[PDB]
Amino acid sequence: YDGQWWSMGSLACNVLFFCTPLFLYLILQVEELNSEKRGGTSNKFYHNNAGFFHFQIYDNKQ
Amino acid sequence: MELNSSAKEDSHYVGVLGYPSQHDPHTLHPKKHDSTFTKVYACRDMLWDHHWEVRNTLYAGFKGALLGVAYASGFGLISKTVPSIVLKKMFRFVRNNNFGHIRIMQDLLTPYALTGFGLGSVYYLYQHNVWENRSNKWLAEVLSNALFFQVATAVCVNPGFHIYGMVGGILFGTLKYAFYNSSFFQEKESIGSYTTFGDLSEEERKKQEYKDYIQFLGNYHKVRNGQLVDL
Amino acid sequence: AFGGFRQTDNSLIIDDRRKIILNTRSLNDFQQKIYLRNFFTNYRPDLSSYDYFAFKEKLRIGELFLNEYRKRINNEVRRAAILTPTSSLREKMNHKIADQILDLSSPHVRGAHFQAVRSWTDASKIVNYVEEKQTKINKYGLQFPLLGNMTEEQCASKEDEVYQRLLKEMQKPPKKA
Amino acid sequence: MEFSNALLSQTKLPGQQYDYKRCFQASNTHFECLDSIRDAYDNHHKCPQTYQAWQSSCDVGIRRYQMDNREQQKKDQLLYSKEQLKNYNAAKNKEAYGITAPKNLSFAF
Amino acid sequence: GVWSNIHPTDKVTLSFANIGRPFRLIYRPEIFLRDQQAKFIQLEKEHIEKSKKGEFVETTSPLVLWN
Amino acid sequence: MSIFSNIWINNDLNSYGLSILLLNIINYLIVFMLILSVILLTNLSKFKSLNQFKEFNSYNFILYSLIFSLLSMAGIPPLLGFTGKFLAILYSSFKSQYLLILFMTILNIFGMYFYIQNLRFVVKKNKSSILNYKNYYVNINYSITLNIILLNFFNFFGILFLSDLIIILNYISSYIYI
Amino acid sequence: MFLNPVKDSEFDDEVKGFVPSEGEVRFVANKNKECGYYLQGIEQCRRKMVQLAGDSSSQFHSLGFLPCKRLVDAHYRCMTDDKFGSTIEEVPEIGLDSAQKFFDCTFQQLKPMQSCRRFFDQVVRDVYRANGSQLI
Amino acid sequence: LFFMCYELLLIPSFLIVYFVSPSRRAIQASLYFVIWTQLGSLLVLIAISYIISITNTYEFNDLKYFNFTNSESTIIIFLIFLGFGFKAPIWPFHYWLTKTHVEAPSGFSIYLSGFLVKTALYGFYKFNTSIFIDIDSSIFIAICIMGVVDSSLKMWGQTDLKKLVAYG
Amino acid sequence: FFWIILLIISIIGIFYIISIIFDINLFKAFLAYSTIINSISFILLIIAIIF
Amino acid sequence: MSSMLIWGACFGLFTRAAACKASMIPLTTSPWKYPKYMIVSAVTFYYFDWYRRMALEQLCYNEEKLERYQIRAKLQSLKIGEELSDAYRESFFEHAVQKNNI
Amino acid sequence: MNISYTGLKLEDYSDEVIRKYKFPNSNELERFLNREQTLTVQQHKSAIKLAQQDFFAVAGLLSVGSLSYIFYNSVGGKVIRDRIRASRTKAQKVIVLALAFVANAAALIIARNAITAHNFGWQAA
Ligand SMILES: CCCCCCCCCCCCCCCCCC(=O)OC[C@H](COP(=O)([O-])OCC(O)COP(=O)([O-])OC[C@@H](COC(=O)CCCCCCCCCCCCCCCCC)OC(=O)CCCCCCCCCCCCCCCCC)OC(=O)CCCCCCCCCCCCCCCCC
Ligand SMILES: CCCCCCCCCCCCCCCCCC(=O)OC[C@H](COP(=O)([O-])OCC(O)COP(=O)([O-])OC[C@@H](COC(=O)CCCCCCCCCCCCCCCCC)OC(=O)CCCCCCCCCCCCCCCCC)OC(=O)CCCCCCCCCCCCCCCCC
Ligand SMILES: CCCCCCCCCCCCCCCCCC(=O)OC[C@H](COP(=O)([O-])OCC(O)COP(=O)([O-])OC[C@@H](COC(=O)CCCCCCCCCCCCCCCCC)OC(=O)CCCCCCCCCCCCCCCCC)OC(=O)CCCCCCCCCCCCCCCCC
Ligand SMILES: CCCCCCCCCCCCCCCCCC(=O)OC[C@H](COP(=O)([O-])OCC(O)COP(=O)([O-])OC[C@@H](COC(=O)CCCCCCCCCCCCCCCCC)OC(=O)CCCCCCCCCCCCCCCCC)OC(=O)CCCCCCCCCCCCCCCCC
Numbered sequence A: 001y002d003g004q005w006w007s008m009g010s011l012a013c014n015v016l017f018f019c020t021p022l023f024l025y026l027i028l029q030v031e032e033l034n035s036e037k038r039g040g041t042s043n044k045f046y047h048n049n050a051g052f053f054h055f056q057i058y059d060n061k062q
Numbered sequence B: 001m002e003l004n005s006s007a008k009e010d011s012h013y014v015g016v017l018g019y020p021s022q023h024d025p026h027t028l029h030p031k032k033h034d035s036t037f038t039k040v041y042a043c044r045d046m047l048w049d050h051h052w053e054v055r056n057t058l059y060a061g062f063k064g065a066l067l068g069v070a071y072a073s074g075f076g077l078i079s080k081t082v083p084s085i086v087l088k089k090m091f092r093f094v095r096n097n098n099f100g101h102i103r104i105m106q107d108l109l110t111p112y113a114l115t116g117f118g119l120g121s122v123y124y125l126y127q128h129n130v131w132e133n134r135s136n137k138w139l140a141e142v143l144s145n146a147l148f149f150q151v152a153t154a155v156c157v158n159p160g161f162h163i164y165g166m167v168g169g170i171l172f173g174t175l176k177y178a179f180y181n182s183s184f185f186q187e188k189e190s191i192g193s194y195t196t197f198g199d200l201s202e203e204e205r206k207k208q209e210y211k212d213y214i215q216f217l218g219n220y221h222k223v224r225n226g227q228l229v230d231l
Numbered sequence C: 001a002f003g004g005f006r007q008t009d010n011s012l013i014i015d016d017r018r019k020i021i022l023n024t025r026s027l028n029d030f031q032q033k034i035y036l037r038n039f040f041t042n043y044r045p046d047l048s049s050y051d052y053f054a055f056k057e058k059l060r061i062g063e064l065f066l067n068e069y070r071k072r073i074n075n076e077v078r079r080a081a082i083l084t085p086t087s088s089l090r091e092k093m094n095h096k097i098a099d100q101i102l103d104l105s106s107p108h109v110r111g112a113h114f115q116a117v118r119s120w121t122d123a124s125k126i127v128n129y130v131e132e133k134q135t136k137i138n139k140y141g142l143q144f145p146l147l148g149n150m151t152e153e154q155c156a157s158k159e160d161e162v163y164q165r166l167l168k169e170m171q172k173p174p175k176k177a
Numbered sequence D: 001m002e003f004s005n006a007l008l009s010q011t012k013l014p015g016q017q018y019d020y021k022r023c024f025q026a027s028n029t030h031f032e033c034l035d036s037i038r039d040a041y042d043n044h045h046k047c048p049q050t051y052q053a054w055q056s057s058c059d060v061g062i063r064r065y066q067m068d069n070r071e072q073q074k075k076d077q078l079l080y081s082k083e084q085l086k087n088y089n090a091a092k093n094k095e096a097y098g099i100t101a102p103k104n105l106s107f108a109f
Numbered sequence E: 001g002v003w004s005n006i007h008p009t010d011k012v013t014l015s016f017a018n019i020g021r022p023f024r025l026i027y028r029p030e031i032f033l034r035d036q037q038a039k040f041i042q043l044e045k046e047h048i049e050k051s052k053k054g055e056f057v058e059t060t061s062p063l064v065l066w067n
Numbered sequence F: 001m002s003i004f005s006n007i008w009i010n011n012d013l014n015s016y017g018l019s020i021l022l023l024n025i026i027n028y029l030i031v032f033m034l035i036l037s038v039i040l041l042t043n044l045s046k047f048k049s050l051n052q053f054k055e056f057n058s059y060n061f062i063l064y065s066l067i068f069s070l071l072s073m074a075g076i077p078p079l080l081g082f083t084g085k086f087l088a089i090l091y092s093s094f095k096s097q098y099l100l101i102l103f104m105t106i107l108n109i110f111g112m113y114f115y116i117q118n119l120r121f122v123v124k125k126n127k128s129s130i131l132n133y134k135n136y137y138v139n140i141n142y143s144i145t146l147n148i149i150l151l152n153f154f155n156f157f158g159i160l161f162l163s164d165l166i167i168i169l170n171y172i173s174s175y176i177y178i
Numbered sequence G: 001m002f003l004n005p006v007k008d009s010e011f012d013d014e015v016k017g018f019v020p021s022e023g024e025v026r027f028v029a030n031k032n033k034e035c036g037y038y039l040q041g042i043e044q045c046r047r048k049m050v051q052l053a054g055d056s057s058s059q060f061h062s063l064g065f066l067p068c069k070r071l072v073d074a075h076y077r078c079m080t081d082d083k084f085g086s087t088i089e090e091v092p093e094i095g096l097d098s099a100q101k102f103f104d105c106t107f108q109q110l111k112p113m114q115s116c117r118r119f120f121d122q123v124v125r126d127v128y129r130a131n132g133s134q135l136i
Numbered sequence H: 001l002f003f004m005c006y007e008l009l010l011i012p013s014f015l016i017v018y019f020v021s022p023s024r025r026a027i028q029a030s031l032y033f034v035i036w037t038q039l040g041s042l043l044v045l046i047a048i049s050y051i052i053s054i055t056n057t058y059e060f061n062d063l064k065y066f067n068f069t070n071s072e073s074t075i076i077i078f079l080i081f082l083g084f085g086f087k088a089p090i091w092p093f094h095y096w097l098t099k100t101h102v103e104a105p106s107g108f109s110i111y112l113s114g115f116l117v118k119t120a121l122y123g124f125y126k127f128n129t130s131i132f133i134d135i136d137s138s139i140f141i142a143i144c145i146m147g148v149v150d151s152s153l154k155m156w157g158q159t160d161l162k163k164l165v166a167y168g
Numbered sequence I: 001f002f003w004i005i006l007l008i009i010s011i012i013g014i015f016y017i018i019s020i021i022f023d024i025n026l027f028k029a030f031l032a033y034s035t036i037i038n039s040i041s042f043i044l045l046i047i048a049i050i051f
Numbered sequence J: 001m002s003s004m005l006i007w008g009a010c011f012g013l014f015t016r017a018a019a020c021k022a023s024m025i026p027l028t029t030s031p032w033k034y035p036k037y038m039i040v041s042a043v044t045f046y047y048f049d050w051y052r053r054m055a056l057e058q059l060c061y062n063e064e065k066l067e068r069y070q071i072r073a074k075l076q077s078l079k080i081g082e083e084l085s086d087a088y089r090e091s092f093f094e095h096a097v098q099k100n101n102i
Numbered sequence K: 001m002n003i004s005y006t007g008l009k010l011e012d013y014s015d016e017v018i019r020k021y022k023f024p025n026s027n028e029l030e031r032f033l034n035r036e037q038t039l040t041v042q043q044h045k046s047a048i049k050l051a052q053q054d055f056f057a058v059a060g061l062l063s064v065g066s067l068s069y070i071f072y073n074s075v076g077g078k079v080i081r082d083r084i085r086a087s088r089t090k091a092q093k094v095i096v097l098a099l100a101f102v103a104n105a106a107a108l109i110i111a112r113n114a115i116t117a118h119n120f121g122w123q124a125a
């Protein structure tokens, strides 16, 4: 029947499992607050290389 | 055909062009020497005043009620099956009363009209008091519509369809951002148009445009890469 | 040819240099390129593609070089621990060595972190440091087999140049004070 | 198609017809005079008689098409030459057999 | 080879990568650019003639075209 | 459309969406022709329900021709229908229609499963007998098989030669002054 | 590049690095993006002139690279924002040495444009450092 | 060509699963595989269309001279991440992977898990390192961590060795 | 005027067939609904073109 | 490779072989159809090779006219009041006066 | 195209300008024209020829060695293979043992030769 998933097992554990992704995201953001205030690594797509791939062969032809 | 034309208007562009502006007050100013009847009749400008929150709420409620009545006329009533005894009793009422069809229509459309009015009023208040001054307009529309339609589908239709209500709300929010808050098929400006300010001579403007063209040349891949044959 | 994507925002753009006013939704491809998309996405946009590739390689080598400093000082600490008994070990470590260990901490050297968070000024300084070391090495031509490739004629010319430079340096008198 | 000069010129009155022989004879005469004048911009007033004959003989749409074609021809003549175009096309066709590899580590822009 | 001998780029890239761009730009870009620059060519010619003469025109100075 | 001292520059080819529409119509007609030729080669009375897709479980040519035709109609990348769908999405992106792209993708994925689900029914316990008998033997038509083979070749390798077809369609549409 | 020699150095050659101001970096990047057409034109025209009159017996051998003069002047004007003169010959004394180095790189040594753009950018940087508020 | 090579891998793998798998459930597993992977393929196709239509280039290196606005960049990264995560299994898009691994040939499961899920990683790396992205990656990191946690927690409840290896 | 009508028709048709196309059980119905789906897709493309 | 005639001949040969395989008849059946298919394929693909280039050339020529339509279509698409604006006034006068040379 | 020698006179330009825009040495002009400032096209052609020859040798040797090893050691079970090799003649045993090893080893040596740049003229001291 509809909604049996919530009741089956334990409601508290089911809700915790359901909210786990939200907890992970919130923990990541709280951790990133520390990175922002300190100056360490932050959750971003760093672009140090101007599109230059790792150990790529860059050559030209005559 | 445009949706929400007034909101998405370029005041500066219409002003420089001289085009009439939809933001004009649109108000009546009866004279002190005018008749009492004229003074009373000039009060109707409050029905045009767009800053009147009560007026806007009633406007949204009327829109919702009309939509609900249209849905009832088209699909709702025809899909719903009435008991045979109820149908016989109401037909007997029509026979025994003049204009019984009007009262039957009132009875049948009361639920749809009332729910539509409630939805319209609540939606207007929701969108106006909340989400009106958010930064990401697309995200605001998507989230607001998702939540509102989730609740609406849970209540009006069935609590078991709230996920579908939320998905439909996301789709409706994207559609509204596309064609209601934005002008994709309602353009009132030429692409690339601009206005000139300052006392710049035509020679200076032409020189700047020549520089802009030289910069624009770099957009072409062949010229940038130097991969052109000698003509 | 590069193009653009239609904009939906109803903001106004005032270009003081060209003395015109545009609207965000009305911009064409070239106007979008000029006004939007003109931000920088690298430490040194002023450099060409080849120059910035060299800059990127020098920055990577400089990060590795700072990590090498940290590894070398750690190895020296291990050497000190083995050679010197625990008595007087901390007394002798409370010197240049301890200060260098602290000065080569994580903010200054990216040990194992995914990214060394450096502003463009810091990246330029690291590249300049790497280039200073390269200049010092190339003065005497120590980079032929390692950190460089050259032909036989180039090697011979470099040997003659280094010989002349060493002779001149030796003939120079000692620095006063 | 409201903006299409060609499609608008293809329109006509129910009984309208074009005498192509006469129109083209008149246009040839007028354009020969214009070419003899050999000016950057076509000044029809320098050829009054032929201009009047051309206007009478040819229809407005035909005249519009002819003037646009003449402008394009003038631009092409100012720009290119027969031998130059031949050499350029030959070089481009020869190049088409090869590949266009990217130029890595450029110097411009 | 033969099927691609019309263009140096491969056929799949020609079909998909180029969307909306004129075939004059895809093939024979030099003629496309020269047609685009038609009037700028004469402006540059006039600027060069005046520069040889005493006059120096600053309005058309940026127009130094090589393609 | 750009203006530089009253000189207009146009890097957009207006007669391109019509060419893409013609390309999509032609690709669908070709794939429809392929599947219908496969059907016509066989006995028509056998196919009357989606369950009867198992009746296509015949010798390798018919079986795999049906499979690849269904995949092409679905829009699987290597096949012909993918070219039309991909070019439609490319033109939508060029015209900056993100909502249209969203709805196209929803329809495309739903239709993709609609076509794919029949591959489940194609599985059959044994080999079907769907060929008409003539002179006491099954009648296999060499001409229709050859046409199906040409259609199969083009369905497999349309991407390679699509540039020529795109050139021809753009050439046809360029005459329209819109 | 971006290295200053040590005035009081114990050994013959010593260099200390410096970082250009953000304003200088922004100016150089913007001007390069705007004027990159001229640099590619200089390369293509250099190759074209060498092909046309490279041979000694050619009639135009005595006019070598003069057609490149217009491209070089246009590039200089574009990089300097039409100020500080309308020609490369009008370069200020602060950048005259770098201008001479660039000309030697391009026309005498025929070195790659990758190399010679360094000297041209050095000319622009010298002018920008000299003036500061005049260019922005 | 990069995108076309990425998309070509579907047909041979589907045919192998469809015609070589002994189990009868492989017929439905193949359809699940096709649909789930094709949804992500369509997402990556939309991203490629955004890149190509906006930037007419195809050399994979001309993107250095073109900068995508914030909205375009966020759309591209979201589409790219979701599309390539459909192939490289991420939570919640691993139902197809479990079904296919359970019901596929034992010899083809090796190839699938070992290689066919890493072409997506390679493509994601190429595209995201070529494009400049100015968005917080916390959401993507959370998705990956949730997938790791979900698979690890479910490992215990599998008595089927093949499904357990699929969760690994 | 055509753009809004086409958009409404396309949206209604898509949301009406999303469920119906999975309710058929006939070969002829499959062929007809293939035609219908392709027609809707081409209508969306036509909207994009007329934009 | 480079010869469209040879490419078409190979295509016809492989088409005949595939047709035999699909029909489940020996590949040596109806041998006279091999040269027939090769000749037909060579001729048709040679003609198509010529036709594609002719179509491309005519399309390039048509794009010149289409540019004229685009410029004039853009001016006529201007919203009311923009045809005399500073951004389009000069171009509008150029197309309404200078090009009124009938 | 306005970029041409037509109309240019040395009188118009200053002596310093002419010296600046003067053609370099004839040898320098030839090197620049032929793109042989650092390496010659003939050097490139020789390198390509050696590369192709090395690849063909390596691939052929690998194929020969692999196939020989497979066919010699894929005759049956251990007992069957041992008996066949015992009945095998002396020269046949020698070839069976040596062919695969020699082919594979020659391929690997040719591969190692390229990375090892021993033929450098600076060997001295
Ligand atoms: C938001 C602010 C936060 C800060 C403030 C401080 C924290 C406040 C948190 C709230 C605490 C009070 C409310 C909890 C009530 C219980 C849960 C509930 O309602 O579900 C229905 C409840 C549970 O139903 P069920 O789980 O289906 O029953 C299973 C059977 O009992 C059969 O069981 P079994 O024999 O099979 O054994 C299984 C058992 C044991 O299971 C196991 O052994 C496996 C492990 C299970 C999880 C144990 C907790 C681990 C730590 C969780 C940390 C969460 C972090 C993420 C969230 C952060 C949010 C800030 O499973 C259970 O634990 C079930 C008992 C209920 C869950 C208890 C654990 C989770 C409670 C919430 C904790 C939140 C902490 C937040 C702060 C964290 C630090 C920053 O049903 C009942 O009422 C039946 C009785 C159950 C026992 C009740 C014991 C007394 C609880 C207090 C009663 C008075 C409450 C007054 C509230 C006043 C208004 C606020
Ligand atoms: C012009 C074309 C139409 C001409 C007339 C018909 C002849 C042509 C027929 C062919 C055309 C298709 C017909 C399809 C029929 C479908 C089935 C059906 O209903 O008939 C079966 C029905 C039963 O057939 P039976 O079984 O043989 O007869 C049994 C009984 O003996 C029958 O006796 P009974 O008394 O039971 O039936 C009376 C029947 C006929 O109706 C009447 O009795 C006469 C009604 C006259 C209109 C009254 C409303 C006020 C009009 C004001 C006009 C001036 C406005 C100025 C505004 C100025 C602003 C500055 O009642 C109805 O139809 C019910 C609705 C009537 C009220 C319509 C209200 C429209 C406006 C609503 C606005 C929203 C209000 C929101 C709430 C506001 C609260 C403050 O047949 C008939 O009774 C005869 C045909 C009547 C057809 C009426 C069709 C509806 C149109 C009514 C007028 C609409 C005016 C709109 C403009 C003004 C708006 C304010
Ligand atoms: C007797 C024929 C002898 C042919 C010898 C080879 C000569 C070329 C073929 C000429 C055939 C002409 C007549 C049509 C016969 C086929 C249709 C038919 O009805 O047959 C019935 C006939 C008898 O009926 P049946 O056998 O009972 O029916 C079974 C079914 O047909 C089912 O059989 P199936 O499952 O084996 O069918 C093949 C299957 C799966 O087939 C495949 O997957 C083909 C794989 C080919 C190997 C190389 C793939 C490399 C891909 C790298 C990535 C490229 C990315 C490029 C970017 C865009 C995306 C491609 O389906 C597909 O092909 C769909 C996927 C297509 C993927 C697109 C790949 C494009 C590659 C383009 C060539 C690249 C060359 C690079 C090197 C040169 C550079 C200058 O069938 C056969 O006898 C067997 C036909 C099997 C396919 C033959 C071709 C495979 C080998 C191709 C080698 C040359 C490369 C391809 C280009 C060719 C020129 C355009
Ligand atoms: C990238 C996507 C590409 C999508 C492509 C979609 C279409 C692909 C599949 C269909 C392609 C056409 C296949 C040929 C026609 C079908 C019949 C046939 O020839 O086989 C029977 C016949 C079999 O002979 P048999 O088995 O000894 O005896 C059969 C009976 O016992 C006794 O036979 P019978 O006596 O009853 O009949 C004899 C007659 C039977 O054949 C026929 O009657 C022909 C039936 C088809 C008529 C329509 C053809 C249209 C061609 C133009 C392009 C559009 C194609 C559209 C196709 C689908 C339309 C729904 O045989 C012939 O004469 C064959 C001539 C075929 C060439 C006709 C060319 C007409 C061109 C007209 C337009 C020219 C340009 C105008 C420009 C104007 C500008 C102002 O074929 C052969 O003898 C050779 C077979 C092996 C080689 C086939 C080579 C096919 C080459 C196709 C090239 C397609 C265009 C280039 C590629 C475009 C994309 C890059």
Ligand SMILES: CCCCCCCCCCCCCCCCCC(=O)OC[C@H](COP(=O)([O-])OCC[N+](C)(C)C)OC(=O)CCCCCCCCCCCCCCCCC
Pocket: A023, A026, A027, A029, A030, H136, H138
């Ligand atoms: C067993 C040990 C368990 C340890 C605890 C595990 C984690 C518990 C949950 C932590 C919640 C942290 C919430 C604050 C972080 C918000 C991050 C953020 O910016 O998100 C905005 C997000 C959006 O973020 P965004 O990504 O759009 O931000 C824009 C991007 N940046 C920031 C980069 C510019 O908005 C939300 O939707 C937040 C909804 C919050 C709902 C209410 C949560 C209340 C939680 C209370 C927890 C209990 C009190 C603390 C207990 C511990 C005390 C020591």
Ligand SMILES: CCCCCCCCCCCCCCCCCC(=O)OC[C@H](COP(=O)([O-])OCC[N+](C)(C)C)OC(=O)CCCCCCCCCCCCCCCCC
Pocket: B134, B135, B136, B137, B139, B140, B142, B143, B144, B146, B147, B170
């Ligand atoms: C085709 C694309 C599909 C897109 C899918 C869109 C996803 C739709 C998800 C709907 C979720 C349900 C409605 C949420 C309404 C509230 C939103 C909000 O507050 O954000 C507005 C504010 C307004 O933001 P803003 O507009 O001022 O700033 C935007 C910032 N940038 C530009 C960086 C994006 O936004 C946020 O702070 C959150 C943004 C991310 C969305 C987070 C949703 C969290 C939902 C769970 C809330 C839990 C509350 C506590 C209870 C926890 C459980 C016990």
Ligand SMILES: CCCCCCCCCCCCCCCCCC(=O)OC[C@H](COP(=O)([O-])OCC[N+](C)(C)C)OC(=O)CCCCCCCCCCCCCCCCC
Pocket: J013, J025, J026, J027, J028, J034
């Ligand atoms: C000046 C001009 C002079 C021209 C002189 C005339 C030249 C004629 C050349 C004829 C060559 C015939 C070769 C036959 C080879 C058969 C091999 C074989 O046994 O295969 C059987 C195999 C097997 O067939 P099967 O189906 O019977 O299988 C038997 C095996 N079991 C039992 C297991 C089933 O099938 C084939 O390959 C035969 C069919 C294909 C034959 C292809 C012939 C191509 C001919 C091309 C000619 C090109 C000429 C170009 C001229 C250009 C001039 C400008």
Ligand SMILES: CCCCCCCCCCCCCCCC(=O)OC[C@H](COP(=O)(O)O)OC(=O)CCCCCCCCCCCCCCC
Pocket: J001, K055, K056, K059, K060, K063, K064, K067
């Ligand atoms: C197994 C041996 C491998 C040898 C290493 C090189 C292999 C190169 C690829 C060969 C592929 C098979 C032949 C293809 C023929 C074809 O149609 O080839 C057709 C094409 C012709 O191309 P063009 O038409 O463009 O000229 O062939 C080539 O381009 C070159 C073919 C290879 C040339 C080297 C031959 C080496 C012979 C070695 C003999 C000893 C081998 C012993 C093995 C036990």
